[PDB]
Amino acid sequence: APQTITELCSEYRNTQIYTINDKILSYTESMAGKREMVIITFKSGETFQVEVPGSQHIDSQKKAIERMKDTLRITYLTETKIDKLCVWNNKTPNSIAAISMKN
Amino acid sequence: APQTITELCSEYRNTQIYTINDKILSYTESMAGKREMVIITFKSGETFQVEVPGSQHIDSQKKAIERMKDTLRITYLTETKIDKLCVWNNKTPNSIAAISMKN
Amino acid sequence: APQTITELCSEYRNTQIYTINDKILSYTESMAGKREMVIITFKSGETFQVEVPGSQHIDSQKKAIERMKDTLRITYLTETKIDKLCVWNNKTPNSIAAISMKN
Amino acid sequence: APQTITELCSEYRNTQIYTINDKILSYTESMAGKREMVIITFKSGETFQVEVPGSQHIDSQKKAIERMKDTLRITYLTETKIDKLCVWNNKTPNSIAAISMKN
Amino acid sequence: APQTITELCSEYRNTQIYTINDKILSYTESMAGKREMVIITFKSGETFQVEVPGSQHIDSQKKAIERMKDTLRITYLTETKIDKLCVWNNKTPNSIAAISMKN
Ligand SMILES: O=[N+]([O-])c1cccc(O[C@H]2O[C@H](CO)[C@H](O)[C@H](O)[C@H]2O)c1
Ligand SMILES: O=[N+]([O-])c1cccc(O[C@H]2O[C@H](CO)[C@H](O)[C@H](O)[C@H]2O)c1
Ligand SMILES: O=[N+]([O-])c1cccc(O[C@H]2O[C@H](CO)[C@H](O)[C@H](O)[C@H]2O)c1
Ligand SMILES: O=[N+]([O-])c1cccc(O[C@H]2O[C@H](CO)[C@H](O)[C@H](O)[C@H]2O)c1
Ligand SMILES: O=[N+]([O-])c1cccc(O[C@H]2O[C@H](CO)[C@H](O)[C@H](O)[C@H]2O)c1
């Protein structure tokens, strides 16, 4: 199994690493039908989403998507710095696949 | 997908964006039968609710409703500032569709 | 829908608003069979419970019950101050129906 | 219903109250096969456990066990004072039936 | 049941204790298909993971894996120090089987 977010990110297609090294600026959360999602933005404009579950995802991802959202909320509320993001870049805004935080 | 709360809110009928820019003055949670809901209030005078789950909600939303409540709770205890809200105004008090916190 | 706890509390018989204006003194949690419940007391000498799930509750309340417990735990933990509590007074100790915080 | 932990404890056999009045010294968690449990010790040498879910446990407790582990985890992290513990003494280490905290 | 992580660790084949005594340097989380895992790292360069739920786990382990992931996250965010950890050395990174915290 991978050691880093970078090797892990490298196993899928349509992905790339973003080096952020900054806390999240804004957090948006929606329960609107067909739009149950989460969106984060960074000071320099970058915007990422945690997509609404759907057919693209596998059953194992269902529990993982929920965990990712819980993660983004506590991180924002604590103003915790995000190191890197592994995002699928075939979606607008880009979709979050993995995240890392460094101390 | 949408990139801001405003963009998202407009995809629905009967919604309106509210610019709070202040924390939740009041928080009410209820386990009472048929009133299993949350109510929040702002110093501005405005009150908002997270509806009792019902027939008007799609399955996708069932789980998002639970998260919104979790979120409002921590937001209130943390005294986190809310940026703006997207609410259905065909309900009283107005129903919460999405939320955004900034800075 | 109600705009306030007083309002929601009034929709029930054997109900009563207690104006606390104080944080919790003690928190007791039990996982002993048939007594899976939480009890809280205050400096004023009052004691309330979040009842063990039973046939006195309709299905919609099951999720809400657990939530009340999560709310009460963290509230005690954060030394958060309670504003008011709507409770059913036909139980000993009085059973929590809803809670409000403010400030 | 029971108004205090000492009252509650008294309803079962093979139980006894341990007045700790001290924060938790160590916290141990195992996700190992059939050793899915939590262990806590205090400076006064006493050690306790929240048991692996099993035959002794009725369906209702099942949810209770989980919550209990959640409580100990946060109690440890915030260094909050446990007042008393209602434990089953027919287990080694003694088994937690109910916890109590006071501030 | 065991009373100490070490003792617990001995009960298993292919395990081994590592004395860390330090906080988590980095935390990585992935919701990508089949790589739904958590990876932790320390300043000494030690990397450990919480494996993807697979055929190697029994049903009771499934819930404990999720809890193991919650703990490492909050533990990281709170800058809490890990004392020891029992791991499976037949995987790369070594897989966490239990963790202990002190003081
Ligand atoms: O979110 N949607 O896709 C959607 C589609 C159609 C109607 C709609 O609004 C209806 O339901 C929501 C919550 O579900 C609120 O209760 C509104 O007051 C109610 O009128 C929402
Ligand atoms: O929640 N309701 O919709 C509802 C409707 C009608 C009565 C009612 O009270 C009954 O159950 C509650 C817990 O729900 C308490 O146990 C009260 O002590 C009991 O008398 C509750
Ligand atoms: O909780 N109860 O209602 C109840 C009823 C009867 C016995 C009883 O104790 C038994 O089970 C618990 C977990 O419940 C512990 O494992 C004790 O060590 C075991 O001997 C508990
Ligand atoms: O937990 N048990 O009872 C148990 C019994 C026998 C083997 C065993 O280890 C196997 O599974 C664990 C996670 O369970 C790790 O992935 C090990 O690397 C793998 O080899 C675990
Ligand atoms: O995660 N995977 O194992 C995996 C395997 C194959 C394709 C793949 O990308 C697809 O699904 C992800 C979410 O999983 C995003 O929605 C991407 O936009 C979409 O292109 C992802």
Side-chain angles (χ1 to χ4, degrees):
Chain A
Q3 325 295 131
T4 37
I5 177 165
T6 304
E7 54 187 82
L8 151 43
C9 208
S10 297
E11 310 183 355
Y12 304 74
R13 298 171 303 170
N14 304 291
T15 59
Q16 70 169 117
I17 298 291
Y18 267 90
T19 305
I20 301 306
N21 276 143
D22 196 18
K23 47 163 182 163
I24 311 165
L25 184 78
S26 67
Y27 166 94
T28 296
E29 177 198 309
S30 163
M31 54 154 273
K34 254 53 197 146
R35 239 67 192 205
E36 305 78 10
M37 68 192 259
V38 155
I39 306 171
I40 64 166
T41 295
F42 291 100
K43 181 274 146 192
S44 44
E46 306 76 40
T47 306
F48 302 104
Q49 65 160 319
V50 165
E51 299 175 70
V52 321
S55 315
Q56 343 88 82
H57 310 116
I58 62 173
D59 199 67
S60 13
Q61 276 176 300
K62 304 296 181 171
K63 52 95 204 320
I65 290 166
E66 298 308 302
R67 174 177 296 293
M68 182 75 258
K69 277 136 59 193
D70 295 341
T71 289
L72 295 173
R73 175 182 59 210
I74 191 66
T75 290
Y76 168 80
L77 292 176
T78 56
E79 292 167 50
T80 292
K81 192 178 286 293
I82 282 180
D83 190 8
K84 306 161 190 295
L85 284 178
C86 168
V87 305
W88 279 281
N89 55 216
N90 52 351
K91 294 283 158 61
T92 51
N94 287 181
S95 184
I96 292 174
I99 184 211
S100 67
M101 285 139 12
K102 177 186 170 299
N103 235 96
Chain B
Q3 309 201 43
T4 59
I5 179 169
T6 303
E7 191 181 339
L8 190 157
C9 203
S10 306
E11 296 183 57
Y12 305 85
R13 304 171 74 110
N14 285 288
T15 57
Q16 177 171 38
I17 281 285
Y18 274 82
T19 316
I20 316 295
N21 269 95
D22 181 43
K23 56 203 183 77
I24 301 174
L25 160 65
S26 214
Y27 173 90
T28 298
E29 170 180 304
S30 167
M31 57 160 268
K34 293 174 177 179
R35 293 295 170 186
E36 305 92 356
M37 68 200 288
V38 176
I39 293 175
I40 58 172
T41 272
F42 296 95
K43 322 178 197 307
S44 71
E46 299 160 8
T47 302
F48 303 101
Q49 93 189 97
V50 170
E51 300 178 72
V52 165
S55 319
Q56 69 275 27
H57 299 109
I58 178 172
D59 260 36
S60 325
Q61 292 176 283
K62 246 65 180 177
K63 32 279 293 182
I65 299 180
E66 294 317 318
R67 175 183 297 281
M68 182 57 64
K69 284 136 77 179
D70 282 343
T71 302
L72 300 181
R73 193 214 284 107
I74 331 308
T75 294
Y76 171 81
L77 292 176
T78 300
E79 297 179 50
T80 301
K81 283 187 277 198
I82 295 179
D83 173 28
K84 89 202 342 97
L85 281 158
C86 168
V87 313
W88 282 291
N89 58 20
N90 57 156
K91 223 121 256 179
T92 189
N94 288 336
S95 204
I96 300 173
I99 180 183
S100 66
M101 285 158 247
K102 194 198 284 182
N103 238 171
Chain C
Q3 319 254 337
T4 54
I5 188 157
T6 155
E7 185 171 338
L8 182 160
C9 208
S10 81
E11 308 187 357
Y12 299 89
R13 307 62 54 203
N14 305 138
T15 252
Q16 174 192 341
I17 281 295
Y18 270 87
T19 165
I20 312 300
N21 201 18
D22 192 21
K23 69 154 282 75
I24 308 163
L25 169 85
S26 75
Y27 174 96
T28 304
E29 190 184 309
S30 170
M31 69 155 124
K34 291 334 300 145
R35 296 290 191 197
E36 305 85 357
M37 65 200 283
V38 21
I39 298 169
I40 58 156
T41 67
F42 293 85
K43 176 206 170 173
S44 58
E46 322 279 23
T47 297
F48 306 97
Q49 64 170 132
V50 163
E51 298 185 69
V52 173
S55 54
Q56 66 265 28
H57 299 124
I58 61 174
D59 268 273
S60 50
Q61 292 175 278
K62 289 169 164 49
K63 220 286 88 184
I65 289 187
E66 300 311 298
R67 180 176 296 280
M68 190 50 93
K69 290 157 171 179
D70 291 343
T71 299
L72 294 189
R73 172 215 267 142
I74 192 57
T75 294
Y76 171 78
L77 263 1
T78 50
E79 286 184 14
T80 278
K81 8 68 213 169
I82 306 297
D83 177 25
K84 295 168 169 60
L85 293 177
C86 167
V87 307
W88 286 279
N89 61 19
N90 64 162
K91 252 57 172 178
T92 321
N94 292 345
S95 176
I96 302 173
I99 173 179
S100 65
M101 270 113 102
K102 167 206 170 193
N103 287 321
Chain D
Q3 105 121 94
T4 44
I5 184 162
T6 32
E7 281 190 13
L8 183 151
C9 213
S10 302
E11 287 186 20
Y12 310 83
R13 70 176 101 294
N14 315 127
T15 56
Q16 82 175 76
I17 292 287
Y18 271 93
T19 312
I20 273 86
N21 185 28
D22 193 17
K23 66 175 174 70
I24 304 164
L25 177 63
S26 81
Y27 174 86
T28 307
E29 188 199 309
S30 166
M31 60 168 262
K34 189 41 54 263
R35 237 71 180 162
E36 298 89 6
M37 69 196 289
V38 153
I39 304 181
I40 57 156
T41 66
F42 295 89
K43 164 271 184 170
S44 306
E46 339 90 305
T47 296
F48 306 89
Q49 54 144 332
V50 5
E51 284 182 273
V52 174
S55 283
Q56 331 81 275
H57 310 115
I58 66 178
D59 47 21
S60 43
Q61 279 176 298
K62 256 85 176 191
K63 304 283 289 297
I65 291 166
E66 287 306 293
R67 174 171 290 284
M68 185 60 86
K69 287 175 291 192
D70 287 348
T71 298
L72 271 9
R73 177 173 64 204
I74 195 62
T75 296
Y76 171 84
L77 298 167
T78 52
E79 300 185 330
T80 115
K81 221 113 289 188
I82 278 75
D83 181 42
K84 287 146 162 289
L85 282 171
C86 167
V87 297
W88 281 286
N89 54 36
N90 63 339
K91 252 73 176 46
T92 283
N94 279 172
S95 196
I96 300 181
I99 68 167
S100 167
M101 308 167 270
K102 192 196 79 60
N103 188 64
Chain E
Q3 288 183 50
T4 297
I5 192 182
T6 311
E7 177 170 344
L8 170 281
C9 209
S10 278
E11 297 198 344
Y12 299 90
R13 189 192 60 162
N14 299 312
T15 69
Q16 163 191 348
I17 296 273
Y18 277 80
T19 292
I20 312 318
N21 228 91
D22 186 25
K23 61 160 279 68
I24 301 173
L25 185 73
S26 125
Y27 169 97
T28 294
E29 182 191 313
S30 158
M31 52 160 262
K34 289 182 161 297
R35 204 60 45 171
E36 304 92 351
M37 55 198 281
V38 161
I39 298 174
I40 60 167
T41 249
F42 294 93
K43 75 151 300 300
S44 58
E46 308 302 323
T47 298
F48 307 94
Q49 70 167 311
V50 171
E51 292 177 70
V52 185
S55 58
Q56 76 261 224
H57 302 109
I58 60 183
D59 261 79
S60 62
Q61 264 187 310
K62 308 290 183 172
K63 287 305 95 202
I65 292 182
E66 297 308 303
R67 173 183 306 283
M68 191 59 254
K69 287 183 283 181
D70 294 337
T71 54
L72 301 185
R73 163 214 278 152
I74 188 59
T75 287
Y76 168 77
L77 290 168
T78 61
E79 283 183 30
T80 293
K81 297 221 321 311
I82 300 313
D83 175 52
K84 303 168 172 296
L85 51 73
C86 178
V87 292
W88 276 292
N89 59 35
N90 60 340
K91 304 289 186 153
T92 311
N94 290 339
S95 203
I96 295 155
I99 185 165
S100 83
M101 285 147 250
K102 182 186 280 289
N103 293 318

